[PDB]
Amino acid sequence: AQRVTFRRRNPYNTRSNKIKVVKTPGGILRAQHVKKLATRPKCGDCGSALQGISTLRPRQYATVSKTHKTVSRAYGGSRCANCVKERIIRAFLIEEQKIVKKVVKEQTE
Amino acid sequence: AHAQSKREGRHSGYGKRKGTREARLPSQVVWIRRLRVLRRLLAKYRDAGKIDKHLYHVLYKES
Amino acid sequence: AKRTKKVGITGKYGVRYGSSLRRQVKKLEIQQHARYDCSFCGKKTVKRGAAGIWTCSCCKKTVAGGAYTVSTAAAATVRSTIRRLREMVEA
Amino acid sequence: AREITDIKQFLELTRRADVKTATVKINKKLNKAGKPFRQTKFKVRGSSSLYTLVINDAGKAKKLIQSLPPTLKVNRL
Amino acid sequence: MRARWRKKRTRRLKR
Amino acid sequence: GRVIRNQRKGAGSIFTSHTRLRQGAAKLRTLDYAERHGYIRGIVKQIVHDSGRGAPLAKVVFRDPYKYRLREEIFIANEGVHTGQFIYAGKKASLNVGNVLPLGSVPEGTIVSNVEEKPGDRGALARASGNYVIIIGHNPDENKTRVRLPSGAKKVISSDARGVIGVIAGGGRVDKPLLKAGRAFHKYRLKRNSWPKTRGVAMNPVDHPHGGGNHQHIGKASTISRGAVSGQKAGLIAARRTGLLRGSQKT
Amino acid sequence: AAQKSFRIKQKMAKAKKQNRPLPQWIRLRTNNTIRYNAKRRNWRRTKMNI
RNA sequence: AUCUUGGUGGUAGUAGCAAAUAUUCAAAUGAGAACUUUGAAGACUGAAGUGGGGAAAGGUUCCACGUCAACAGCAGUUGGACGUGGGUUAGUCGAUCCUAAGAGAUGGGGAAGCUCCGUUUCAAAGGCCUGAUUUUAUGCAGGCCACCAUCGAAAGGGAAUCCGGUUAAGAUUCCGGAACCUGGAUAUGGAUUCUUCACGGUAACGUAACUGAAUGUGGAGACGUCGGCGCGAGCCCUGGGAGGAGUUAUCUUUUCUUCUUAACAGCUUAUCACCCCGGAAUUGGUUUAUCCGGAGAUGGGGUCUUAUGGCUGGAAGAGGCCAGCACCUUUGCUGGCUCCGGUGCGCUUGUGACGGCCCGUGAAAAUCCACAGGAAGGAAUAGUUUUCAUGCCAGGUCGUACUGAUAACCGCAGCAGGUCUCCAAGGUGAACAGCCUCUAGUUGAUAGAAUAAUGUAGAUAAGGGAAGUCGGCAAAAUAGAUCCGUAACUUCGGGAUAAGGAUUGGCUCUAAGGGUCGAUCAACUUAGAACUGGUACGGACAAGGGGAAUCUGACUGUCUAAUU
Ligand SMILES: [K+]
Ligand SMILES: [K+]
Ligand SMILES: [K+]
Ligand SMILES: [K+]
Ligand SMILES: [K+]
Ligand SMILES: [K+]
Ligand SMILES: [K+]
Ligand SMILES: [K+]
Ligand SMILES: [K+]
Ligand SMILES: [K+]
Ligand SMILES: [K+]
Ligand SMILES: [Mg+2]
Ligand SMILES: [Mg+2]
Ligand SMILES: [Mg+2]
Ligand SMILES: [Mg+2]
Ligand SMILES: [Mg+2]
Ligand SMILES: [Mg+2]
Ligand SMILES: [Mg+2]
Ligand SMILES: [Mg+2]
Ligand SMILES: [Mg+2]
Ligand SMILES: [Mg+2]
Ligand SMILES: [Mg+2]
Ligand SMILES: [Mg+2]
Ligand SMILES: [Mg+2]
Ligand SMILES: [Mg+2]
Ligand SMILES: [Mg+2]
Ligand SMILES: [Mg+2]
Ligand SMILES: [Mg+2]
Ligand SMILES: [Mg+2]
Ligand SMILES: [Mg+2]
Ligand SMILES: [Mg+2]
Ligand SMILES: [Mg+2]
Ligand SMILES: [Mg+2]
Ligand SMILES: [Mg+2]
Ligand SMILES: [Mg+2]
Ligand SMILES: [Mg+2]
Ligand SMILES: [Mg+2]
Ligand SMILES: [Mg+2]
Ligand SMILES: [Mg+2]
Ligand SMILES: [Mg+2]
Ligand SMILES: [Mg+2]
Ligand SMILES: [Mg+2]
Ligand SMILES: [Mg+2]
Ligand SMILES: [Mg+2]
Ligand SMILES: [Mg+2]
Ligand SMILES: [Mg+2]
Ligand SMILES: [Mg+2]
Ligand SMILES: [Mg+2]
Ligand SMILES: [Mg+2]
Ligand SMILES: [Mg+2]
Ligand SMILES: [Mg+2]
Ligand SMILES: [Mg+2]
Ligand SMILES: [Mg+2]
Ligand SMILES: [Zn+2]
Ligand SMILES: [Zn+2]
């Protein structure tokens, strides 16, 4: 029925120039520029989206409190829970096997 | 008035058709409806204990 | 129903290109799109993703391999040669 | 911008140092039944934010208008 | 947090 | 006459390599103390397609010996190397596929790849998919390994020159026919402007030695002297013989 | 040309001011030989070439 | 001297002013009206528009007042003309910042030299942090790291704004209201601490906060394309009701139309993923698409992202629609209503989880955050903390009118040419085809009279049917859909819509195919039957001619812009 215009001078359908149509309190359709959608932060080990962390465009992370950007654990908003569990197991077991490695070497001496 | 008459089944014979059967209504759309009906009914029966999980599994593959 | 007598995956090429080229493409097309057995996790989930790169869906381990199959014959005989020579030097 | 529910909190706002104006709007509404009632919205202007208290019971409304400070420049409607 | 923000806090405490 | 196609290439304007999507140059680590005297362990973090190249690359991460930091190298992946695998590089690294050893430190018959021509060149020989060098001999007096290259040339190199154990991955690439002009189009889109190619006999005399004539034909011998000059070297340069090779090419 | 440089806009402003006929009183001056504005420009006739 | 420059004829009141369906009546204005303005009528574009905006380009063409000598190949009172003025308002939209292909100083090296190379190099190539000192904003105190200028996007990356109103001409820029970002300053509350730098939850993780230097590691920025499926939005369609308008010989509980809700904020809301319990063959779960499970399935119970939706604030006070009084009033004034639903292989668009494809695997940098680390500092009658709330100040510079083309750009021009892109209604129909219509826009393009030849564009034709002609050139015939029926040959994929047939309207019915809790609600698809007519019926529009062979190039693809 009613047709709409871009509200900015960019007339092309680029990634930065997306619109949705919206009905206003004046009863008329109008374009509304949409920002690009945020992607979820991803784990530094497996690549999965981190649970509990907010999804925002990069610079919006500067405006929000620390609880939106972290979780309450070792490697909070950086590695996922199962990645931290493997790091802990591996650290514990390899550091033990090192004690055994040295003793077995020290016996053979 | 025309839409009402089409609801009653008029204006729909061979001389009023110009798209193919598929163009009019895709055979895939007809399959998806059908298999979604059968899958729904099987789930209902299984969940009310009208059929066991063993009959379910066989019927699901036959659907 | 069986849909082709012989062209198989190469039925996408229709009558073009020559039977002998279609037939050679068919052998390598089957190999390149097969699922392979993962040496790590044991499941049949290794699929190609770009020539020489073979990734498991389950465990996420990638392996360098052949262009169209996970392991080329040359690389097998090398593994065996290297093992042989490794054991010669180590006593 | 912001709806405030607690009346204790609303009264703190009226006495805040940056708060020079308020508004009292009366809406004629209808409840679950078709019985009508006078909703009142109290709105205090603040600085960053307008705050509204919605009071449906016109008793509590009448009390609330009295307990606003006399410094506050209140616009009726 | 960015260096400019860290520096701001450091000035705020230096008073 | 005008400047022919083969002479326009050296100016390197539209004929430069298309490098936007490449990962970086594949190269061994710089040859340092650790590699000369012991070994250093790195991890294979990723195995990744490089545009333009057959073989996949391996992103190997090593610790820096002198500074607290990590150092990603880009190796050409040998067949069989996997993400998470540890790689050992140096004089004392063991004889396993993916490790980087000096050629002095490997027995006769070892298969290696990405071999250095001179020590510390960071890799030169057998880098294309499916290729490798064979060690065929040592000369410990002169400190010189002898090796067979993919071409079948034999070559003597320093025993300090390094290689990677095993064969470059992605082998058997050139067994699949391209089938379509379009596939060759996409192949050369990620390399350089070398395709398609007009035949010299389909051109006019101004454009190529072969051009012209009331039939398409070369008209003089196609074999050209090594001492010919730019603008003449089209056809078969310095050919020892010509015609269909009746036999095996191996030495 | 909606989004234009200042330098271009400054040249256009100059062109606006020059776009006028000769002031009539010049004709009355002693020994005047200027009859009309011989450097008048119009957007439909001749382009400014920037 | 096809002489040079200038001027002028005959030709000649001649060729001509014929593409884009189309004009008509009246009044007004005026010396004058086919052409201006208003009204009435008739038409057209027909949403892949003759509509509404922009990019390049133009540069005032925008708007008003005056106004017709020239220009608008007729006219002219009209104008993109002429004369005189008016007009473009930003912390949030762009530029500005970043890097891309690339361009390019310096150190150096070439070159007689104009200059050339090269872009981090065979260079002694810098500039931050913190405390102070209270001498002062530099030496001093310490530390810290050292890569290599700069330019290069008004479509890439990127801090932040919305609604309503307002002008002759400006508006995401003005006004009113309501927000937000960055930088700065900063003190009040809250929080934290005598177990100094918070607690809860088995856990996934939660919360209003909840120290953290150097250095390091991660993430976001950041990415192909196609396919079906799911979900959202706007639109379309449709029910009830409350208003206004139309039709009314007859019929029509009728036809048309209004019934809206921004950014922002609070609470709540999910596919995926994940956690706990549990321990699976009589294998189960499960997608339209067959994948998943002892590396822990199904099941029971939880956690999370907030795309997106709901409710509330914003906000009815706005906007919309009506009525009743005012009255060539500033232009009012007063009152009412502005509500509740349904539907889907719909359209457009956003998005999710997936799948296909590659010898193709589909930018970079600024910038922002988190983590690891533990430098350093910090309490008891008082210390810490502005990543929690609230509060204070500032946000420069340049662009901003209008056209964007059958008259604002380029093509000597007001030229049937050319020139990047967004939005997109109803019917018919497979359809963004063709044809008709609504919103919006236009009704321009020299006219009048007549109707010879010859044309150009469009048609039809008895009997014959390619006899025409270099040659079936041109035209005709065929054409949609459903059912039937399809040869040689073949690279077994094809050939194939082979060839060749039949059917098709209208009306009145029947049957089958679903959702939600026996009740109840709802789509279109398909098949059949009766009746019926000047045997018509893909009724306009739209829409293959086919076969038997030969030469030749394997195929799709490409070139002689303007004779191939
Ligand atoms: K959190
Ligand atoms: K080319
Ligand atoms: K060729
Ligand atoms: K020739
Ligand atoms: K600005
Ligand atoms: K830009
Ligand atoms: K991009
Ligand atoms: K994909
Ligand atoms: K020109
Ligand atoms: K004939
Ligand atoms: K072709
Ligand atoms: Mg959260
Ligand atoms: Mg269809
Ligand atoms: Mg199908
Ligand atoms: Mg070739
Ligand atoms: Mg030629
Ligand atoms: Mg020549
Ligand atoms: Mg020839
Ligand atoms: Mg020659
Ligand atoms: Mg000039
Ligand atoms: Mg005439
Ligand atoms: Mg003519
Ligand atoms: Mg006219
Ligand atoms: Mg038409
Ligand atoms: Mg029409
Ligand atoms: Mg005008
Ligand atoms: Mg005229
Ligand atoms: Mg005239
Ligand atoms: Mg003017
Ligand atoms: Mg901006
Ligand atoms: Mg230079
Ligand atoms: Mg720049
Ligand atoms: Mg941009
Ligand atoms: Mg305007
Ligand atoms: Mg304002
Ligand atoms: Mg689109
Ligand atoms: Mg404008
Ligand atoms: Mg405009
Ligand atoms: Mg337009
Ligand atoms: Mg022009
Ligand atoms: Mg034109
Ligand atoms: Mg239809
Ligand atoms: Mg006409
Ligand atoms: Mg006839
Ligand atoms: Mg006849
Ligand atoms: Mg006949
Ligand atoms: Mg004849
Ligand atoms: Mg004849
Ligand atoms: Mg013809
Ligand atoms: Mg045939
Ligand atoms: Mg047929
Ligand atoms: Mg051809
Ligand atoms: Mg031509
Ligand atoms: Zn992880
Ligand atoms: Zn695996």
Side-chain angles (χ1 to χ4, degrees), chain F residues 117-147:
Chain F
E117 273 180 305
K118 281 182 284 185
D121 91 358
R122 302 181 68 191
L125 310 181
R127 305 171 112 235
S129 71
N131 285 118
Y132 58 83
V133 157
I134 306 157
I135 285 52
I136 63 187
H138 301 287
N139 196 324
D141 304 298
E142 290 190 56
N143 192 55
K144 292 249 180 286
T145 296
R146 185 166 200 261
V147 302

mmCIF file of all heavy atoms in Angstrom, chain F residues 117-147:
data_model
loop_
_atom_site.group_PDB
_atom_site.id
_atom_site.type_symbol
_atom_site.label_atom_id
_atom_site.label_comp_id
_atom_site.label_asym_id
_atom_site.label_seq_id
_atom_site.Cartn_x
_atom_site.Cartn_y
_atom_site.Cartn_z
ATOM 1 N N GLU F 117 67.435 -25.708 0.515
ATOM 2 C CA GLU F 117 68.543 -25.836 -0.420
ATOM 3 C C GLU F 117 69.858 -25.512 0.279
ATOM 4 O O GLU F 117 70.855 -26.199 0.064
ATOM 5 C CB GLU F 117 68.413 -24.913 -1.632
ATOM 6 C CG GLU F 117 67.611 -25.521 -2.772
ATOM 7 C CD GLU F 117 67.477 -24.598 -3.974
ATOM 8 O OE1 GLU F 117 66.993 -23.453 -3.767
ATOM 9 O OE2 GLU F 117 67.834 -25.032 -5.101
ATOM 10 N N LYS F 118 69.863 -24.404 1.020
ATOM 11 C CA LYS F 118 70.995 -23.980 1.820
ATOM 12 C C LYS F 118 70.495 -23.919 3.247
ATOM 13 O O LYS F 118 69.298 -23.738 3.440
ATOM 14 C CB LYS F 118 71.534 -22.668 1.240
ATOM 15 C CG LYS F 118 72.400 -22.910 0.000
ATOM 16 C CD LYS F 118 73.041 -21.700 -0.668
ATOM 17 C CE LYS F 118 72.070 -20.897 -1.481
ATOM 18 N NZ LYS F 118 72.746 -19.811 -2.201
ATOM 19 N N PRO F 119 71.345 -24.126 4.277
ATOM 20 C CA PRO F 119 70.864 -24.153 5.655
ATOM 21 C C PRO F 119 70.306 -22.794 6.056
ATOM 22 O O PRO F 119 70.927 -21.763 5.795
ATOM 23 C CB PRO F 119 72.047 -24.605 6.504
ATOM 24 C CG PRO F 119 73.238 -24.424 5.609
ATOM 25 C CD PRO F 119 72.773 -24.428 4.169
ATOM 26 N N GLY F 120 69.092 -22.821 6.621
ATOM 27 C CA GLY F 120 68.374 -21.628 7.037
ATOM 28 C C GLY F 120 67.640 -20.881 5.922
ATOM 29 O O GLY F 120 67.161 -19.779 6.173
ATOM 30 N N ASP F 121 67.494 -21.463 4.725
ATOM 31 C CA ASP F 121 66.712 -20.835 3.664
ATOM 32 C C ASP F 121 65.204 -20.879 3.972
ATOM 33 O O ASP F 121 64.419 -20.191 3.315
ATOM 34 C CB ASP F 121 67.124 -21.368 2.300
ATOM 35 C CG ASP F 121 66.385 -22.575 1.736
ATOM 36 O OD1 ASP F 121 65.494 -23.116 2.417
ATOM 37 O OD2 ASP F 121 66.700 -22.964 0.589
ATOM 38 N N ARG F 122 64.810 -21.759 4.905
ATOM 39 C CA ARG F 122 63.475 -21.883 5.460
ATOM 40 C C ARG F 122 62.538 -22.672 4.546
ATOM 41 O O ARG F 122 61.342 -22.681 4.818
ATOM 42 C CB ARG F 122 62.859 -20.564 5.936
ATOM 43 C CG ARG F 122 63.737 -19.902 6.982
ATOM 44 C CD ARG F 122 63.141 -18.622 7.478
ATOM 45 N NE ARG F 122 61.937 -18.900 8.251
ATOM 46 C CZ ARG F 122 61.094 -17.969 8.639
ATOM 47 N NH1 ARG F 122 61.345 -16.696 8.394
ATOM 48 N NH2 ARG F 122 59.992 -18.306 9.282
ATOM 49 N N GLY F 123 63.057 -23.368 3.521
ATOM 50 C CA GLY F 123 62.302 -24.360 2.762
ATOM 51 C C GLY F 123 62.231 -23.983 1.285
ATOM 52 O O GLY F 123 62.046 -22.810 0.954
ATOM 53 N N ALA F 124 62.371 -24.978 0.410
ATOM 54 C CA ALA F 124 62.587 -24.729 -1.007
ATOM 55 C C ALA F 124 62.046 -25.858 -1.868
ATOM 56 O O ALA F 124 61.347 -25.571 -2.829
ATOM 57 C CB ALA F 124 64.056 -24.528 -1.300
ATOM 58 N N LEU F 125 62.448 -27.096 -1.574
ATOM 59 C CA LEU F 125 62.240 -28.231 -2.450
ATOM 60 C C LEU F 125 61.108 -29.111 -1.923
ATOM 61 O O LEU F 125 60.976 -29.261 -0.720
ATOM 62 C CB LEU F 125 63.540 -29.015 -2.469
ATOM 63 C CG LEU F 125 64.806 -28.205 -2.742
ATOM 64 C CD1 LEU F 125 65.971 -29.144 -2.738
ATOM 65 C CD2 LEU F 125 64.732 -27.499 -4.067
ATOM 66 N N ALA F 126 60.363 -29.741 -2.844
ATOM 67 C CA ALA F 126 59.234 -30.612 -2.537
ATOM 68 C C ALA F 126 58.265 -29.897 -1.602
ATOM 69 O O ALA F 126 58.245 -30.164 -0.407
ATOM 70 C CB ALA F 126 59.699 -31.924 -1.954
ATOM 71 N N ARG F 127 57.534 -28.931 -2.153
ATOM 72 C CA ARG F 127 56.502 -28.268 -1.390
ATOM 73 C C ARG F 127 55.129 -28.445 -2.034
ATOM 74 O O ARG F 127 54.135 -28.189 -1.374
ATOM 75 C CB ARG F 127 56.823 -26.787 -1.328
ATOM 76 C CG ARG F 127 58.183 -26.390 -0.794
ATOM 77 C CD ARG F 127 58.320 -24.893 -1.051
ATOM 78 N NE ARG F 127 58.304 -24.218 0.241
ATOM 79 C CZ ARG F 127 57.533 -23.257 0.657
ATOM 80 N NH1 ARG F 127 56.737 -22.597 -0.145
ATOM 81 N NH2 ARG F 127 57.601 -22.941 1.929
ATOM 82 N N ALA F 128 55.047 -28.858 -3.296
ATOM 83 C CA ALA F 128 53.745 -29.006 -3.904
ATOM 84 C C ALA F 128 53.123 -30.317 -3.450
ATOM 85 O O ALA F 128 53.832 -31.249 -3.091
ATOM 86 C CB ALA F 128 53.812 -28.934 -5.408
ATOM 87 N N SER F 129 51.798 -30.364 -3.538
ATOM 88 C CA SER F 129 50.987 -31.437 -2.996
ATOM 89 C C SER F 129 51.477 -32.760 -3.568
ATOM 90 O O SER F 129 51.756 -32.835 -4.756
ATOM 91 C CB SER F 129 49.533 -31.189 -3.288
ATOM 92 O OG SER F 129 49.262 -31.366 -4.678
ATOM 93 N N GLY F 130 51.718 -33.735 -2.687
ATOM 94 C CA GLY F 130 52.072 -35.084 -3.082
ATOM 95 C C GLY F 130 53.561 -35.283 -3.377
ATOM 96 O O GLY F 130 53.928 -36.363 -3.841
ATOM 97 N N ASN F 131 54.423 -34.296 -3.112
ATOM 98 C CA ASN F 131 55.827 -34.416 -3.478
ATOM 99 C C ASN F 131 56.691 -34.627 -2.245
ATOM 100 O O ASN F 131 56.298 -34.278 -1.140
ATOM 101 C CB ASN F 131 56.362 -33.162 -4.151
ATOM 102 C CG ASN F 131 55.879 -33.042 -5.569
ATOM 103 O OD1 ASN F 131 55.176 -32.083 -5.891
ATOM 104 N ND2 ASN F 131 56.203 -34.005 -6.416
ATOM 105 N N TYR F 132 57.902 -35.117 -2.482
ATOM 106 C CA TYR F 132 58.857 -35.371 -1.426
ATOM 107 C C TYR F 132 60.241 -35.551 -2.030
ATOM 108 O O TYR F 132 60.347 -35.873 -3.207
ATOM 109 C CB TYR F 132 58.457 -36.641 -0.681
ATOM 110 C CG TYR F 132 58.365 -37.844 -1.594
ATOM 111 C CD1 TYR F 132 59.493 -38.566 -1.931
ATOM 112 C CD2 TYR F 132 57.150 -38.230 -2.145
ATOM 113 C CE1 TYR F 132 59.415 -39.664 -2.773
ATOM 114 C CE2 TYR F 132 57.055 -39.314 -3.004
ATOM 115 C CZ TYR F 132 58.195 -40.037 -3.318
ATOM 116 O OH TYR F 132 58.143 -41.114 -4.157
ATOM 117 N N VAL F 133 61.266 -35.451 -1.181
ATOM 118 C CA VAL F 133 62.641 -35.747 -1.544
ATOM 119 C C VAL F 133 63.049 -37.015 -0.816
ATOM 120 O O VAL F 133 62.619 -37.221 0.310
ATOM 121 C CB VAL F 133 63.480 -34.544 -1.119
ATOM 122 C CG1 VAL F 133 64.944 -34.863 -0.912
ATOM 123 C CG2 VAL F 133 63.281 -33.412 -2.103
ATOM 124 N N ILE F 134 63.911 -37.817 -1.441
ATOM 125 C CA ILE F 134 64.476 -39.004 -0.818
ATOM 126 C C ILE F 134 65.929 -38.705 -0.493
ATOM 127 O O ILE F 134 66.647 -38.212 -1.353
ATOM 128 C CB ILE F 134 64.387 -40.229 -1.743
ATOM 129 C CG1 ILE F 134 62.971 -40.493 -2.226
ATOM 130 C CG2 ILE F 134 64.953 -41.450 -1.030
ATOM 131 C CD1 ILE F 134 62.926 -41.281 -3.520
ATOM 132 N N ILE F 135 66.365 -39.015 0.728
ATOM 133 C CA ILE F 135 67.787 -38.997 1.032
ATOM 134 C C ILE F 135 68.370 -40.256 0.399
ATOM 135 O O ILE F 135 67.794 -41.322 0.582
ATOM 136 C CB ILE F 135 68.066 -38.922 2.536
ATOM 137 C CG1 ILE F 135 67.812 -37.544 3.114
ATOM 138 C CG2 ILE F 135 69.526 -39.290 2.803
ATOM 139 C CD1 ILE F 135 66.472 -36.928 2.819
ATOM 140 N N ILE F 136 69.482 -40.129 -0.336
ATOM 141 C CA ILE F 136 70.104 -41.273 -0.983
ATOM 142 C C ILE F 136 71.551 -41.474 -0.552
ATOM 143 O O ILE F 136 72.153 -42.449 -0.995
ATOM 144 C CB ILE F 136 69.960 -41.216 -2.520
ATOM 145 C CG1 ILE F 136 70.652 -40.042 -3.149
ATOM 146 C CG2 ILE F 136 68.483 -41.268 -2.927
ATOM 147 C CD1 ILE F 136 70.362 -39.897 -4.634
ATOM 148 N N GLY F 137 72.108 -40.641 0.333
ATOM 149 C CA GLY F 137 73.505 -40.815 0.699
ATOM 150 C C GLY F 137 74.034 -39.682 1.562
ATOM 151 O O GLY F 137 73.543 -38.562 1.454
ATOM 152 N N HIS F 138 75.062 -39.990 2.370
ATOM 153 C CA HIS F 138 75.799 -39.001 3.138
ATOM 154 C C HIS F 138 77.272 -39.006 2.746
ATOM 155 O O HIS F 138 77.813 -40.040 2.353
ATOM 156 C CB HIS F 138 75.649 -39.262 4.629
ATOM 157 C CG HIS F 138 74.232 -39.229 5.068
ATOM 158 N ND1 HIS F 138 73.505 -38.063 5.170
ATOM 159 C CD2 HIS F 138 73.399 -40.225 5.404
ATOM 160 C CE1 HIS F 138 72.285 -38.362 5.590
ATOM 161 N NE2 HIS F 138 72.196 -39.662 5.743
ATOM 162 N N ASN F 139 77.886 -37.819 2.840
ATOM 163 C CA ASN F 139 79.312 -37.601 2.663
ATOM 164 C C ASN F 139 79.785 -36.872 3.918
ATOM 165 O O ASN F 139 79.929 -35.653 3.889
ATOM 166 C CB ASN F 139 79.574 -36.847 1.360
ATOM 167 C CG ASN F 139 81.018 -36.911 0.915
ATOM 168 O OD1 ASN F 139 81.940 -36.898 1.741
ATOM 169 N ND2 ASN F 139 81.241 -37.009 -0.389
ATOM 170 N N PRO F 140 79.990 -37.552 5.076
ATOM 171 C CA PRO F 140 80.263 -36.848 6.339
ATOM 172 C C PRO F 140 81.568 -36.050 6.420
ATOM 173 O O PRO F 140 81.707 -35.202 7.300
ATOM 174 C CB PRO F 140 80.224 -37.984 7.392
ATOM 175 C CG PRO F 140 79.530 -39.130 6.693
ATOM 176 C CD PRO F 140 79.982 -39.015 5.254
ATOM 177 N N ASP F 141 82.515 -36.335 5.511
ATOM 178 C CA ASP F 141 83.762 -35.595 5.386
ATOM 179 C C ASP F 141 83.478 -34.189 4.857
ATOM 180 O O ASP F 141 83.842 -33.207 5.503
ATOM 181 C CB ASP F 141 84.749 -36.342 4.500
ATOM 182 C CG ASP F 141 85.072 -37.762 4.947
ATOM 183 O OD1 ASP F 141 85.621 -37.913 6.063
ATOM 184 O OD2 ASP F 141 84.750 -38.706 4.189
ATOM 185 N N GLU F 142 82.810 -34.118 3.694
ATOM 186 C CA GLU F 142 82.389 -32.862 3.088
ATOM 187 C C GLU F 142 81.131 -32.281 3.746
ATOM 188 O O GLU F 142 80.794 -31.136 3.455
ATOM 189 C CB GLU F 142 82.170 -33.021 1.584
ATOM 190 C CG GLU F 142 83.462 -33.228 0.798
ATOM 191 C CD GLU F 142 83.301 -33.160 -0.717
ATOM 192 O OE1 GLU F 142 82.800 -32.126 -1.216
ATOM 193 O OE2 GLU F 142 83.682 -34.137 -1.401
ATOM 194 N N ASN F 143 80.439 -33.049 4.602
ATOM 195 C CA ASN F 143 79.265 -32.607 5.348
ATOM 196 C C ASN F 143 78.111 -32.345 4.377
ATOM 197 O O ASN F 143 77.470 -31.297 4.421
ATOM 198 C CB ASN F 143 79.587 -31.438 6.278
ATOM 199 C CG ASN F 143 78.468 -31.156 7.254
ATOM 200 O OD1 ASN F 143 78.036 -32.057 7.986
ATOM 201 N ND2 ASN F 143 77.977 -29.923 7.274
ATOM 202 N N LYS F 144 77.857 -33.322 3.501
ATOM 203 C CA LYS F 144 76.982 -33.149 2.357
ATOM 204 C C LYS F 144 76.106 -34.394 2.206
ATOM 205 O O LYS F 144 76.602 -35.490 1.979
ATOM 206 C CB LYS F 144 77.834 -32.882 1.112
ATOM 207 C CG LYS F 144 78.571 -31.553 1.066
ATOM 208 C CD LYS F 144 78.093 -30.528 0.051
ATOM 209 C CE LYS F 144 78.894 -29.257 0.081
ATOM 210 N NZ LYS F 144 78.584 -28.423 1.250
ATOM 211 N N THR F 145 74.796 -34.208 2.343
ATOM 212 C CA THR F 145 73.816 -35.219 1.996
ATOM 213 C C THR F 145 73.584 -35.134 0.496
ATOM 214 O O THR F 145 73.770 -34.078 -0.089
ATOM 215 C CB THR F 145 72.549 -34.991 2.827
ATOM 216 O OG1 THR F 145 72.951 -35.199 4.183
ATOM 217 C CG2 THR F 145 71.442 -35.987 2.531
ATOM 218 N N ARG F 146 73.219 -36.264 -0.103
ATOM 219 C CA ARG F 146 72.813 -36.360 -1.491
ATOM 220 C C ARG F 146 71.338 -36.761 -1.510
ATOM 221 O O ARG F 146 70.915 -37.553 -0.673
ATOM 222 C CB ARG F 146 73.770 -37.391 -2.090
ATOM 223 C CG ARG F 146 73.607 -37.559 -3.587
ATOM 224 C CD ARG F 146 74.773 -38.323 -4.204
ATOM 225 N NE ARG F 146 74.793 -38.038 -5.647
ATOM 226 C CZ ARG F 146 74.314 -38.804 -6.638
ATOM 227 N NH1 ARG F 146 73.820 -40.011 -6.400
ATOM 228 N NH2 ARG F 146 74.341 -38.358 -7.887
ATOM 229 N N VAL F 147 70.544 -36.197 -2.427
ATOM 230 C CA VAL F 147 69.097 -36.345 -2.370
ATOM 231 C C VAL F 147 68.534 -36.442 -3.778
ATOM 232 O O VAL F 147 69.115 -35.885 -4.694
ATOM 233 C CB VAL F 147 68.434 -35.195 -1.594
ATOM 234 C CG1 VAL F 147 68.948 -35.077 -0.169
ATOM 235 C CG2 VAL F 147 68.588 -33.848 -2.281
#
